[PDB]
Design a protein around this ligand. Structure first.
Ligand SMILES: CCCCCCCCCCCCCCCCCC(=O)OC[C@H](COP(=O)([O-])OCC(O)COP(=O)([O-])OC[C@@H](COC(=O)CCCCCCCCCCCCCCCCC)OC(=O)CCCCCCCCCCCCCCCCC)OC(=O)CCCCCCCCCCCCCCCCC
Ligand SMILES: CCCCCCCCCCCCCCCCCC(=O)OC[C@H](COP(=O)([O-])OCC(O)COP(=O)([O-])OC[C@@H](COC(=O)CCCCCCCCCCCCCCCCC)OC(=O)CCCCCCCCCCCCCCCCC)OC(=O)CCCCCCCCCCCCCCCCC
Ligand SMILES: CCCCCCCCCCCCCCCCCC(=O)OC[C@H](COP(=O)([O-])OCC(O)COP(=O)([O-])OC[C@@H](COC(=O)CCCCCCCCCCCCCCCCC)OC(=O)CCCCCCCCCCCCCCCCC)OC(=O)CCCCCCCCCCCCCCCCC
Ligand SMILES: CCCCCCCCCCCCCCCCCC(=O)OC[C@H](COP(=O)([O-])OCC[N+](C)(C)C)OC(=O)CCCCCCCCCCCCCCCCC
Ligand SMILES: CCCCCCCCCCCCCCCCCC(=O)OC[C@H](COP(=O)([O-])OCC[N+](C)(C)C)OC(=O)CCCCCCCCCCCCCCCCC
Ligand SMILES: CCCCCCCCCCCCCCCCCC(=O)OC[C@H](COP(=O)([O-])OCC[N+](C)(C)C)OC(=O)CCCCCCCCCCCCCCCCC
Ligand SMILES: CCCCCCCCCCCCCCCCCC(=O)OC[C@H](COP(=O)([O-])OCC[N+](C)(C)C)OC(=O)CCCCCCCCCCCCCCCCC
Ligand SMILES: CCCCCCCCCCCCCCCCCC(=O)OC[C@H](COP(=O)([O-])OCC[N+](C)(C)C)OC(=O)CCCCCCCCCCCCCCCCC
Ligand SMILES: CCCCCCCCCCCCCCCCCC(=O)OC[C@H](COP(=O)(O)OCCN)OC(=O)CCCCCCCCCCCCCCCCC
Lengths: 92, 93, 231, 178, 51, 149, 116, 109, 359
């Protein structure tokens, strides 16, 4: 920096070092809080696909999954039977 | 809208799932309940929630003490050799 | 989004459907062979036990305190004007002390937090010990909220606004009966749904449904009055 | 929605609340147009305060047109705004919203007095002169008076012909598959 | 406009302590839209292979 | 018999004759007339121009004179040159609108929306279950404005 | 420390909070509005990269154009302040007492209230 | 609108287009064969070639709309007739001029 | 791309024709005063350089082209589907909304023409802005995606800002006392300031909502959004209630700031105070018939799958607004304030009706 000293005399490091440190500490604390506690809670991956889920949300999700699977299986079977019956009736 | 393009002018990776979902929705008389499989596949290809859950589980397992040494990969023969066996390409040798 | 989902649950319907029930115990049973640390850590289920009156009172107090702090953050403090000398002194404290903002926030939010905690605890105890087993739920909610908010407005705000407190309490009780004790936008059952019990053949069920349809026809005014043209 | 041996019966028309909302919007626009036409017929600079409602104290046509427009905005039964308000309350009852009905009524009565209080200011000691002068004489616009007269007729007798408007609005909304 | 650079004599401390610090605290406590995105270093880079 | 011949100068009056008050048909509903070209481009639509479209343009030209003068009657503080220029602009706009209407008519004839001179081999006939207008139209002037199978 | 998604989602509303917080000087509010538009620009680009969405990527130039037009309007209004005789510091355009201002003091344009 | 078959069929891929001439020709052929069969329930397997042509030419949404319209038409044909509907509508329009007074002191219900 | 079907852009021809005609005539009028007199030309009368053209001809031109658009709609035919890359929807309900907006605009323009003949306090630029608004505002109901809706509303907002900019400021009244004294009126700046900042807030919030809707669902089309939300409810795959609630809140708050509903109403009062009566006459029509109607259709038709979140937000907003205005509506003392608060009260009532409908 040409005339680096004259340029950096007034503000070598910070204008309000205390406030800069408070900003850094708040940012660090908030990142810690979010990542460690808040986002994992919302994601709810601790008991994901657990065979014995103790969480109501996970139990509801597994219920939705099994119910959708049962619906798809039943409808596929019924449609196959219906198509077979129609094909049999066609050749008469 | 769903343009269906990639970031280099190609095809969006979700396009097959999106086409399947739209086809099912048009065909079915009860699209909401009868297109669950296609819609879930599209949402998975879009959000990747299941892969993130798998990664979370794998991170927990790695944190737990169960794995010591993975087998080395012999690239010349495209095989896997146990870490115990010594090879010329082995780091420790 | 639902309000008071657990209370307004159809146990029979969820049981017949297989849907998971919110009334499940939700408790931990550590083994006798488990570690001492595990046994101690398994005691946290008392924080989930909903029959613990002390736990529920502290829960209601925390809710009230949070509401009071939110009100102070939003409207109360900004509306209230602090003396210039007091503001200068507290700013000087901030300058002369690290984290002075935290202590200033504590001082400013102490009144609102404490009054909110008191209101929440008193309201929970009031509603639970009294009005919990009344017959007319709407009337119970209206009267209880009217009286409670009348007293609250007389004490916290001003004794001269107790009539407005009572009217607001009546309105709040009606609103709570509508959307808290009742499920208007929180339906978990299809309208007209039912369950079948007994060994009735499908033919018998269809015959009964045909009779029900014949009865239902009488609902139409034209057929009942015989005022239909011959098609 | 009723089921009788797998036969669904629907005695409810889903595309009816939207028609009622359109009807309310149209009725408010019509009444707003009536009042604004009355204002535009006159000199605009006179009306700058609620007290200046007395300036409407002009010949019978303008005076009573303003009065009936204010009453219609308030929601007095015979007039047009009543039809919209009554149908909104009817649909709320049909949907079984007693709390919504309560809040609608509170707002309706408060707004009713808000509109009505200006009738007190409409009283004037003498007759106002709010017309622009052109060729040394007050300029009265026959076209705007005719439009105000049609609006007045419909404001007075909207109830009689409301069935046709309701049919048309329901016809428009039925295309929406909701 | 405002060539000299002189600005209004404004004290931000009053509003900071009355409305903004607590409101920001509440918003930060209750605001997170990121659902399941994972930081780098969450898992070893050697597990990722698609790139 | 109910619609003017599509190849005449009055074949553009079939735009006001509609079977139902709907704007557009459903996705899957057959057009009233056989489809000549579903995927019609600009050049082929222009090539499909007809005496009906020319008649629509002529109607626009004839009706744009009274309308242009009506618009001009609200003009003040204008020189003769500007008044004539404004009349020319408005008249050209009306004629351009006529051209647009002719283009739309040609597009409709290609798609079968309006009478294109062809008829489906087997008509899909409705059941007039709800009928509030048959007698009214038969006894009134509006029977001309509606097309019935 | 924070994932980019959460960081940008948070800083957008933080920028809005700063815009509201700073003393209402039209020029300062205009700069803050420009910064808000650029935060949206960055967030849209991030989501477009994540989801392979050319529409999200292309939102960048649309945001730039809207921001440019709004900035032009803001410049014009700030200049119009002079002809309308309004201080850029809006808080000085009313007589309401404000403890946030050290030297806010207005008097009626008179010299003596009492003559006799 | 998530439950609306019409609105869902109005959706399409960015580059998708419909050849209405070909689709309607195929559908007309298939429906003529079905009408010749003249069964209570449409058994498409009785018309294999035309069914395959119809499937290839027409889109899923168009086919869904066509089948629903065919079902409605079958129900209407089973229920009513042209002359019956004409007479009924004429009688109803004639009645509309009169009033519908209440029937006091009824006997039913 | 090999073939460009006429179905993708058939509907754009009438609007482009109207746009061309309007702007060509606008430029001609702008350069109207230029008429060179050649040295050989003879003037029957001395030219009157001072001119103040009445905009009656502009209003009549707007009426004529609106009538032509009505004729196009009446003669319109086609299939019900989307055109131009699924960015615009073409169906019976959308077309009827377009036609209704056009008809109401035509009637209001007719009344305005009569008023202008009565007295002229409005320039040609005022009615050119009205022409742009009338031409571009009915296209909103043809929107098939939130993206195109945002751009159309942004264009209409620019047109309305143009209309507010071209408001007449100084009048030739009978007050002869202020010839040599400075009188300060802030109504013009207040209108511009509040309109500009409300537009900014609404635009940023709507863009944020659009970005997050794209993140949630690969597209921003109404049908795809509703289908994906319903399927998500069925599957229970994506269950970030915080994100869904925040998207709904951002959208609702953006529209609240845009319209000026009871929670945010004072800026609307200021705008009405500063606007002329004719500006209010047109703005109330545009607002109620388009902005509020589309706001209602967001919960009724477009974003219907999210009503499980919208209901509580709407209820809270309605309750807060009612209890906030119950006292304010009796504190005003101005005609413009009365008109604005009439609009606000009707808006709250219609919001309650919308809650009842979405129930
Ligand atoms: C991520 C975004 C934010 C990043 C940081 C900021 C940078 C971006 C700025 C732009 C954004 C908008 C900013 C608006 C500012 C408004 C005005 C203002 O306040 O600043 C003016 C203020 C004065 O300006 P100045 O005049 O130039 O400076 C004069 C002095 O020199 C100044 O020195 P000072 O010492 O006087 O000031 C210090 C200042 C900054 O604060 C600090 O000093 C650092 C505080 C760090 C957090 C400490 C709390 C514990 C954290 C734990 C984290 C891990 C949790 C894990 C949980 C696991 C669970 C399993 O103090 C405060 O702000 C007061 C509040 C701080 C405590 C917050 C407590 C939150 C939780 C409360 C829960 C309920 C408790 C109930 C009672 C319980 C009893 C047991 O400016 C500054 O000091 C610098 C900016 C600081 C902004 C802080 C904003 C509040 C957010 C704090 C962190 C919240 C964490 C939440 C998650 C964790 C919860 C546990
Ligand atoms: C030159 C015109 C000659 C007209 C001759 C009569 C022909 C019919 C009227 C045709 C007018 C067309 C052009 C519009 C002119 C009016 C607007 C205007 O701007 O005029 C400026 C024009 C010149 O300006 P201006 O005079 O300086 O301005 C003064 C203001 O206009 C203020 O003047 P105002 O205070 O006297 O205004 C009347 C006032 C108060 O006016 C009234 O109250 C009207 C009372 C009518 C007498 C019968 C009432 C019976 C009610 C029984 C209960 C029914 C319940 C039904 C259930 C639903 C609820 C109704 O305001 C209202 O009308 C609002 C209340 C409306 C209540 C709704 C009653 C509906 C009854 C429907 C008819 C029932 C017939 C049953 C028998 C037949 C069965 C087959 O005004 C006039 O020259 C005087 C107009 C006065 C009203 C004329 C109509 C009253 C007589 C109606 C007899 C026929 C029955 C009604 C049905 C008519 C066909 C739909
Ligand atoms: C129950 C609640 C009901 C609420 C209703 C709310 C609205 C009520 C008030 C307004 C109603 C409309 C009034 C007529 C238009 C205004 C101008 C006018 O005609 O007077 C000037 C003109 C005065 O002539 P003048 O004094 O000798 O010379 C005037 C100037 O010196 C020289 O004049 P100029 O050369 O400057 O201008 C000449 C031109 C001036 O007139 C104009 O330019 C017309 C201006 C209005 C344009 C918009 C009309 C929309 C009509 C459709 C329904 C919606 C109405 C919405 C109205 C409010 C919108 C904000 O005159 C005309 O050509 C008049 C023709 C009027 C009929 C136009 C019909 C258009 C239909 C388009 C849609 C068709 C269906 C499409 C379906 C598509 C399906 C896919 O009028 C007359 O010559 C006759 C006046 C006396 C008879 C008036 C009869 C009015 C009948 C209204 C029926 C309303 C619908 C049926 C009832 C619905 C509820 C049950
Ligand atoms: C590329 C260009 C190179 C050439 C540039 C020119 C070089 C020569 C001039 C440089 C200094 C500028 C002139 C200063 C003149 C005034 C002297 C003075 O008062 O003291 C200066 C400064 C005084 O700072 P201050 O505290 O007064 O700053 C506040 C300033 N006011 C008062 C205006 C608000 O001295 C120091 O701060 C020394 C102690 C802190 C040093 C910084 C520590 C943190 C950053 C480095 C971390 C390094 C790693 C360790 C951390 C952990 C790592 C894991
Ligand atoms: C929009 C609708 C508005 C509705 C307005 C509602 C009115 C609100 C009035 C609030 C009054 C103040 C709170 C009263 C709290 C006590 C209520 C109670 O005990 O009833 C519960 C018990 C619980 O009843 P229950 O629920 O077991 O049985 C209900 C019975 N049926 C179904 C028939 C309705 O109810 C009653 O016995 C009284 C019911 C009627 C309300 C009577 C209020 C009396 C208030 C004055 C008391 C005076 C005491 C002595 C002092 C006299 C003066 C010196
Ligand atoms: C925050 C909690 C409270 C929320 C309350 C929400 C519900 C409010 C219900 C209000 C009902 C009345 C609707 C009309 C409101 C009119 C507002 C207005 O501006 O009016 C001013 C006028 C009075 O003002 P004024 O006309 O004298 O003003 C003169 C001008 N100034 C003031 C400048 C000098 O109010 C009225 O005219 C009366 C209104 C109708 C009253 C109807 C009867 C009473 C209804 C309530 C029940 C009371 C039961 C008491 C039983 C006692 C038994 C012993
Ligand atoms: C809210 C805002 C308003 C509404 C929304 C705005 C919509 C914006 C999007 C509109 C898209 C429109 C795209 C149309 C593209 C097709 C055009 C077309 O029909 O071409 C057919 C023809 C081709 O027809 P074709 O497609 O049949 O040809 C191919 C035929 N085959 C395949 C068989 C070989 O196009 C052309 O040949 C010309 C192409 C354009 C050439 C460049 C024109 C530039 C014009 C600049 C402006 C000039 C102004 C002059 C003013 C004079 C008076 C002052
Ligand atoms: C069996 C054989 C049948 C053969 C039929 C052949 C003829 C077919 C065409 C018939 C046309 C009938 C008249 C159409 C309307 C004429 C309007 C006119 O000239 O008014 C000028 C007038 C001009 O005014 P003016 O000329 O009346 O006088 C004005 C005088 N001052 C100003 C003093 C009051 O136009 C208007 O005022 C309209 C202004 C608004 C714009 C309205 C546009 C309407 C466009 C209509 C297009 C044609 C629709 C045809 C529908 C046919 C349905 C079957
Ligand atoms: C080329 C293609 C086209 C693109 C062209 C791009 C052009 C970029 C133009 C950049 C202009 C730079 C000069 C002007 C800004 C200088 C910084 C400044 O003004 O700071 C303001 C603000 C902090 O201000 P304050 O808190 O008062 O303290 C000042 C301490 N510098 O500043 C801040 O907010 C943060 C400042 C951070 C300063 C960091 C200094 C680091 C010094 C490193 C020394 C060498 C060692 C590096 C080690 C790296 C290890 C990884």
């Amino acid at each position: 920096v040409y005339q680096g000293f004259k340029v950096l005399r007034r503000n070598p490091t910070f204008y309000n070092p205390r406030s800069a440190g408070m900003v850094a500490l708040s940012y660090f604390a908030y990142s810690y809080y979010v990542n460690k506690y808040y986002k994992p809670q919302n994601s709810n991956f601790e008991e994901y696909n657990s065979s014995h889920p103790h969480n109501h949300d996970e139990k509801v999700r597994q219920y939705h999954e099994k119910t959708n699977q049962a619906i798809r299986d039943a409808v596929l079977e019924k449609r196959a039977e219906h198509d077979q019956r129609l094909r049999e009736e066609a050749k008469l | 809208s769903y343009s269906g393009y990639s970031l280099n002018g190609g095809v969006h990776p979700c396009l097959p799932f999106y086409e399947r979902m739209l086809q099912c929705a048009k065909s079915e008389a009860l699209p909401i309940k009868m297109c669950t499989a296609q819609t879930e596949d599209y949402l998975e290809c879009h959000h990747r929630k299941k892969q993130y859950a798998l990664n979370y589980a794998i991170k927990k397992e790695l944190n737990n003490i169960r794995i010591v040494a993975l087998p080395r990969y012999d690239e010349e023969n495209d095989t896997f050799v146990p870490f115990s066996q010594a090879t010329a390409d082995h780091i420790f040798q | 989004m639902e309000l008071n989902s657990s209370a307004k649950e159809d146990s029979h319907y969820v049981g017949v459907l297989g849907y998971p029930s919110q009334h499940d115990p939700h408790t931990l049973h550590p083994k006798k062979h488990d570690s001492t640390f595990t046994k101690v850590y398994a005691c946290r289920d008392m924080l989930w036990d909903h029959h613990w009156e002390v736990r529920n009172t502290l829960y209601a107090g925390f809710k009230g305190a949070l509401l009071g702090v939110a009100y102070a953050s939003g409207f109360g403090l900004i509306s209230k004007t602090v003396p210039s000398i007091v503001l200068k002194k507290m700013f000087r404290f901030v300058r002369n002390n690290n984290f002075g903002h935290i202590r200033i926030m504590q001082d400013l939010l102490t009144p609102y937090a404490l009054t909110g905690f008191g209101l929440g605890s008193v309201y929970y105890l009031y509603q639970h010990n009294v009005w919990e087993n009344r017959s007319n739920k709407w009337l119970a909610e209206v009267l209880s909220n009217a009286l409670f908010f009348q007293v609250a407005t007389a004490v916290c705000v001003n004794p001269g606004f107790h009539i407005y407190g009572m009217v607001g309490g009546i309105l709040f009780g009606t609103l709570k009966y509508a959307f808290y004790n009742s499920s208007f936008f929180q339906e978990k059952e299809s309208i007209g749904s039912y369950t079948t019990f007994g060994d009735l053949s499908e033919e018998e069920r269809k015959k009964q449904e045909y009779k029900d349809y014949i009865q239902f026809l009488g609902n139409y005014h034209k057929v009942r009055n015989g005022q239909l043209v011959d098609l | 929605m009723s089921i009788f041996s797998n036969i669904w019966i629907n005695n409810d028309l889903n595309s009816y609340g939207l028609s009622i909302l359109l009807l309310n919007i149209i009725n408010y626009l019509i009444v707003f147009m009536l009042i604004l036409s009355v204002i535009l017929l006159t000199n605009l600079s006179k009306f700058k305060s609620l007290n200046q409602f007395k300036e409407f104290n002009s010949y019978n046509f303008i005076l009573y047109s303003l009065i009936f427009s204010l009453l219609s905005m308030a929601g007095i039964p015979p007039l047009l705004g009543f039809t919209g308000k009554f149908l909104a309350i009817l649909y709320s009852s049909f949907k079984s919203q007693y709390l919504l009905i309560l809040f609608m009524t509170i707002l309706n009565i408060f707004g009713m007095y808000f509109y009505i209080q200006n009738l007190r200011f409409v009283v004037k000691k003498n007759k106002s002169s709010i017309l622009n002068y052109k060729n040394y004489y007050v300029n009265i616009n026959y076209s705007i008076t005719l439009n105000i007269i049609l609006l007045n007729f419909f404001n007075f007798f909207g109830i009689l012909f409301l069935s046709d408007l309701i049919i048309i609005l329901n016809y428009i909304s039925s295309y929406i598959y909701i | 406009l405002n060539i000299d650079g002189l600005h209004l004599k404004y004290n931000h401390n009053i509003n900071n302590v009355l409305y903004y610090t607590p409101s920001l605290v509440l918003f930060l406590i209750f605001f997170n839209i990121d659902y399941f995105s994972e930081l780098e270093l969450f898992l070893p880079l050697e597990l990722s292979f698609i790139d | 018999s109910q619609t003017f011949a599509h190849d005449s100068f009055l074949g553009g009056l079939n735009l006001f004759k509609r079977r139902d008050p709907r704007f557009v048909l459903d996705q899957g509903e057959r057009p009233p007339y056989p489809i000549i070209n579903s995927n019609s481009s600009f050049v082929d639509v222009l090539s499909n121009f007809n005496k009906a479209d020319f008649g629509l343009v002529l109607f626009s030209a004839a009706i744009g004179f009274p309308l242009s003068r009506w618009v001009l009657k609200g003009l003040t503080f204008s020189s003769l040159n500007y008044r004539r220029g404004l009349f020319s602009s408005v008249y050209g706009g009306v004629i351009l609108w006529g051209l647009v209407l002719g283009f739309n008519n040609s597009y409709y004839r290609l798609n079968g929306f309006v009478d294109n001179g062809l008829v489906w081999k087997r008509k899909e006939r409705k059941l007039n279950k709800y009928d509030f207008t048959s007698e009214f139209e038969d006894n009134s002037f509006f029977k001309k404005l509606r097309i019935r199978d | 420390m924070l994932t980019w998604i959460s960081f940008w989602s948070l800083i957008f509303w933080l920028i809005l909070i700063i815009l509201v917080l700073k003393p209402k000087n039209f020029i300062s509010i205009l700069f803050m509005s420009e910064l808000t538009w650029l935060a949206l620009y960055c967030l849209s680009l991030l989501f477009g990269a994540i989801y392979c969405d050319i529409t999200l990527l292309s939102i960048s130039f649309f945001i730039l154009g809207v921001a440019g037009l709004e900035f032009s309007f803001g410049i014009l209004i700030a200049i119009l302040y002079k002809n309308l005789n309004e201080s850029l510091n809006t808080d000085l355009n009313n007589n309401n007492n404000n403890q946030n201002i050290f030297d806010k003091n207005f008097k009626t344009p008179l010299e003596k209230i009492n003559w006799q | 609108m998530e439950f609306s078959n019409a609105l869902l069929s109005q959706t399409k891929l960015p580059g998708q287009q419909y050849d209405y001439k070909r689709c309607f020709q195929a559908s007309n052929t298939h429906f003529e064969c079905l009408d010749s069969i003249r069964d209570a329930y449409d058994n498409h397997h009785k018309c294999p070639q035309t069914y395959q042509a119809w499937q290839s030419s027409c889109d899923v949404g168009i086919r869904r709309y066509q089948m629903d319209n065919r079902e409605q038409q079958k129900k209407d044909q089973l229920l009513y007739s042209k002359e019956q509907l004409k007479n009924y509508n004429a009688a109803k329009n004639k009645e509309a001029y009169g009033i519908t007074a209440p029937k006091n002191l009824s006997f039913a219900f | 791309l090999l073939r460009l079907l006429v179905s993708e852009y058939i509907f754009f021809l009438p609007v482009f024709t109207n746009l061309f005609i309007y702007w060509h005539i606008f430029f001609k009028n702008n350069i109207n005063l230029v008429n060179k007199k050649n040295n050989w030309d003879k003037s029957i009368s001395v030219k009157n350089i001072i001119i103040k053209q009445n905009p009656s001809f502009i209003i009549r031109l707007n009426l004529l082209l609106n009538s032509l658009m009505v004729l196009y709609l009446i003669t319109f035919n086609g299939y019900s589907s989307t055109f131009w890359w699924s960015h615009f929807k073409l169906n019976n309900y959308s077309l009827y909304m377009y036609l209704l907006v056009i008809i109401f605009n035509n009637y209001f323009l007719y009344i305005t023409e009569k008023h202008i003949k009565i007295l002229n306090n409005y320039s040609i630029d005022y009615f050119f802005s009205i022409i742009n608004i009338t031409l571009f505002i009915p296209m909103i109901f043809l929107s098939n995606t939130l993206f195109t809706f945002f751009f159309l509303i942004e264009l209409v907002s620019c047109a309305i800002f143009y209309k507010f900019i071209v408001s007449k400021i100084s009048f030739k009244n009978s007050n002869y006392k202020d010839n040599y004294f400075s009188i300060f009126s802030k109504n013009y700046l207040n209108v511009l300031f509040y309109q500009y900042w409300s537009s900014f807030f609404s635009s940023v919030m709507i863009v944020f909502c659009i970005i997050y809707l794209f993140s949630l669902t690969g597209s921003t089309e109404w049908s795809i959004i509703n289908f994906i939300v319903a399927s998500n409810n069925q599957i229970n795959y994506y269950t970030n209630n915080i994100t869904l609630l925040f998207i709904c809140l951002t959208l609702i708050i953006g529209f609240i700031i845009k319209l000026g509903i009871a929670p945010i109403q004072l800026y609307k009062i200021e705008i009405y105070k500063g606007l002329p009566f004719l500006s209010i006459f047109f703005y109330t029509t545009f607002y109620f018939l388009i902005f509020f109607l589309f706001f209602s259709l967001l919960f009724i038709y477009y974003l219907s799958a999210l009503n499980n979140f919208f209901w509580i937000i709407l209820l809270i907003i309605s309750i807060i607004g009612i209890f906030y205005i119950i006292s304010i509506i009796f504190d005003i003392n101005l005609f413009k304030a009365f008109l604005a608060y009439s609009t606000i009260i009707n808006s709250i009532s219609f919001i309650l009706l919308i809650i009842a409908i979405i129930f």
